[PDB]
Amino acid sequence: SGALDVLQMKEEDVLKFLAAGTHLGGTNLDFQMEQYIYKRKSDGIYIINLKRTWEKLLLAARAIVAIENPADVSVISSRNTGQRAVLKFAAATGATPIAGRFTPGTFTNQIQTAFREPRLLVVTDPRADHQPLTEASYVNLPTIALCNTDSPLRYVDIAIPCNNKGAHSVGLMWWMLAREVLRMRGTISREHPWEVMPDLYFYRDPEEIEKEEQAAA
Amino acid sequence: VRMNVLADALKSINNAEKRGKRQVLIRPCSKVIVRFLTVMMKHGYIGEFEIIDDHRAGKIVVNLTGRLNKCGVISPRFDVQLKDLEKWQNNLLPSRQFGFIVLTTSAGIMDHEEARRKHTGGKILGFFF
Amino acid sequence: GKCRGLRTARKLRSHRRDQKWHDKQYKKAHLGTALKANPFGGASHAKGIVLEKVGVEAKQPNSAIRKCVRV
Amino acid sequence: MRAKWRKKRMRRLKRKRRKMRQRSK
Amino acid sequence: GRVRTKTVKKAARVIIEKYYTRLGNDFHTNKRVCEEIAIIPSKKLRNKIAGYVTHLMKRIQRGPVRGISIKLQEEERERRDNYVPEVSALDQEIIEVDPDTKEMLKLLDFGSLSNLQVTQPTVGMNFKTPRG
Amino acid sequence: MQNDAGEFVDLYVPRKCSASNRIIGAKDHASIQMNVAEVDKVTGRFNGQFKTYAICGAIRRMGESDDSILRLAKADGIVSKNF
Amino acid sequence: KEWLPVTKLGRLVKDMKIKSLEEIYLFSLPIKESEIIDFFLGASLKDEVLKIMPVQKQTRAGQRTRFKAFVAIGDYNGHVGLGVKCSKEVATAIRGAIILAKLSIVPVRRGYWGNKIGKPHTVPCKVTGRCGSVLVRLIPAPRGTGIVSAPVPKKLLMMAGIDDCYTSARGCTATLGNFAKATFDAISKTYSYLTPDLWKETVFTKSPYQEFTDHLVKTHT
Amino acid sequence: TKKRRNNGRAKKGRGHVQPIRCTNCARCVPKDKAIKKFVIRNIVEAAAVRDISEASVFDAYVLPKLYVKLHYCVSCAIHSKVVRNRSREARKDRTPPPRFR
RNA sequence: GGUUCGAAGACGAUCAGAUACCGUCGUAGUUCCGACCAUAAACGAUGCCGACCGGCGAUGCGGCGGCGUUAUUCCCAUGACCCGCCGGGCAGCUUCCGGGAAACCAAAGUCUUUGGGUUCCGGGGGGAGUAUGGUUGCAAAGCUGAAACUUAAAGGAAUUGA
Ligand SMILES: [Zn+2]
């Protein structure tokens, strides 16, 4: 988010991100989300400032790198939209994801065998994962939440304004976050882009999978 | 009715300190309030302030700092003697290590400790710690 | 009181003086009719003449019949 | 027995007292 | 009302999770395997447990089972949970530029270099859907 | 917290947040020392030193934590001033 | 009898890497282990049973007379605690009271009275903690005075170490369930107070999990 | 204690409303205190429309409807068994039951 | 002036026992004029004035600006929309602002860290708003207002057995 003069952007990915749908906001508005508004669009649409989302993403990635151990990173997901996205993000990072079914008793209570302690937590949606927002107050755990203009800001540590309705808008932000964490850690050189069609990383509907299988075979 | 404006100003900055505000805006430009701000500036409980002076009661912007618990008002203003000052500071101030009782004299506005050395009483203004 | 007045000494003094009459514990000890009905009238000890003895029942379950003396 | 009936019985009793005072005076 | 009981459900998942290798779709195969590995007192309870084991095997052959933790499905999940990609997305030379961020990045160390191009402002009318 | 000799008689010192200028209580379970890893300007990798922050429970239960961290980073010189 | 480290900080206690128990209070980490306090402070950690309160919840099968044990814990010059555990049998009630008393321990704040010499003895400033109808106004006292209060908070202040304090009760203080929480909150809100002496900022350091995060993940699972 | 947040009626800052007599009994009920009902219904029940469509002079005669605004008090509404006691969290909901069929 | 309704009262059963539930009647009242008194749950079971302390959708008034519209279609701006902003007035939803024993309140918060101005009123419960004192009234009734005697209780909130 500061003291770098390497990453720089020019023009072209407007035509990709308009088709992706990351600029799309919610219908209503929270009063704490008034500073993240860039512009408006017809019939109840906010335009989320993607290059301020870039700066919040850089601050969150600094938090991810400051959590030096990659094993104790909790990636919490709630809905069926963000399952394959956090699965491929756990493939890129090397951590333990939670794709739904939060169990009260694993972290709060000391009876069950699954008693872990990951420091960093990533919340997909506050209104959906309202229950993992509770243990951030009882236990000293930082929180990187993904929020909309309709979503409020309560018992959160840092928030990133993104669309959490479209599967393209979810998988796009995870697919962009996975490069930033790996380049700020540093394993692979800063040389090449990605060639393969991005249909692998987004969440796919089973009717779409059957339609693509019928079109292929 | 707004008879004691200084009481409402102390209540407003007290609620501002309870919420945790960084700055405060008040309406009058009373010289007693300005001298009380310059008294608190020498102790260093709040930051430096500024005024916007119209051709009326000019507005005051005070940049507050988190170095104050509560500054209550004394209404009505009673006289303070040298012999009774111990009984004032016993129930008015919480502790003996910290605590200030501002009061005006015929010479000028000063704290309670300098008036003990100068041996000259006066009417009480307020208390802050 | 509720009024934080400056020249309001005698008003709150009269209010406290009327509160002294409205108080029950102070008023009962300083009655003339109660002191007239009091057989002592400030006395500690008193003599008397025994004329008869009357038995008095007791109250609920813990019962007895105790003999008082009409003096 | 209600407070209204107690007030009514005391109203009748005070009316009887006023009648006795009117016969006495 | 042939409902498989909790004494069957606590046993059968542990039996499959331990001896997942020595199993089969046939009833007479794992009916004799349960006789070896487990001690079942009665034939009716043995047949109920073996039928529920064959039903769980049919559930495995259809798809993934939420309750049991199969080692093979755990390895299949671990492959797509630790498959590190070669080259991921971001650092191409040409990504988006926003005009209101162009003003705020000029102050600190994100200055206006030669590799920048401001875009046209996006069209928009009104940000409230009618309330009905 | 001195004595007649001059040594600090207290044995531990509590924390104080720099954003809201308020102290941090003892049993404040929402208090987080947020660390930020320092990044080189020409390499873009991990260096070894960190930058610390302070988060108290009052700012979190009020609902201004992501703004307070933003203002602290803006005052330290990471996040730009205008935003 | 042998303790097993459940939490991750328990492995640091078992390996003797954290040396100070006040470093837990500095990072404000939640203590969910009972044997760590008994390991460090074993002989000094004393128990005092204040009062057993029987309560009878009424069911269709008569009533279940369950007990509520109040157990104060701690050395006479140091840390104190307050554990509240209600159970139906006295052995489990006393055991749970001792466990919750070992979990919930608080430090008390000693202060000076005007003149600065020697060790602090009194309450530094006028603080209080109110809940229910109990309000104990903690007022400082000169040296060699005592605790002018009820004998149970006098015993709690003897356990605390503050030998000199004047109190001022208000309201119905007979309610012990609100009285124990009030005298717990009054000594808990002593350090949580802005003072003019505390103007210098507190220096920070690395988290103890971040310091040994490479060793704790490899020494066990 | 005070059971409801309001006083069981829609009187906000007026003081007096128009009294409306009840339908079942002769209780003098206020307007906002009354439980009001509006039920529409055809005059035929099961087969009268079929009998008229079989035997008539006119062809495709339209049927009228019933329009009676019913009023009930607290006792009469429960005696006609319309309203029902709900949970304390459901008492705060001023929403009607859903109109599906 | 008295149509309807309908205290007192009659009749019919009702009931071991009804000038109680219910119906048919039915006097005074029910409506106004010229007057008398001050009584209601005149309840919001909540003293008045001035200020600080979150957000949201909308209704009723006035003013203001503007894509697309209807009416006069035909210039012209207001009636009817929609999108906004402010003030006064009435509400609601959410809420670790704040407090209480809880119901819950942007006030019932700005109380122990107790003092913004500010009139009236209650001191365990009954007797009892009773005697007595005068005042106003044709009458009904309203005002201030005790005492002897008895009483370890009388109460508020919020849960079980049925
Ligand atoms: Zn009715």
Numbering used by the authors:
A (entry chain BB): 2 to 218
B (entry chain XX): 2 to 130
C (entry chain YY): 2 to 72
D (entry chain n): 1 to 25
E (entry chain SS): 2 to 133
F (entry chain WW): 1 to 83
G (entry chain DD): 58 to 278
H (entry chain bb): 2 to 102
Authors' description from the paper:
A modular architecture of three pseudoknots (PKI, PKII and PKIII) is crucial for these IRESs to establish a balance between structural flexibility and rigidity, essential for interaction with the ribosome and with two elongation factors (eEF2 and eEF1A) required for IRES translocation through the ribosome. Type IV IRESs require two translocation events to place the first aminoacyl-tRNA in the P site making use of the intrinsic dynamic elements of the ribosome involved in canonical translocation.
PKI is in an intermediate position between the P and E sites of the small subunit as well as the aminoacyl-tRNA is in an intermediate position between the A and P site of the 40S. This configuration is maintained by a distinctive swiveled configuration of the 40S head, resembling one of the late stages recently reported for the first translocation event. This conformation is maintained until the very last moment as the intermediate captured here with eEF2 presents a back-rotated configuration of the 40S.
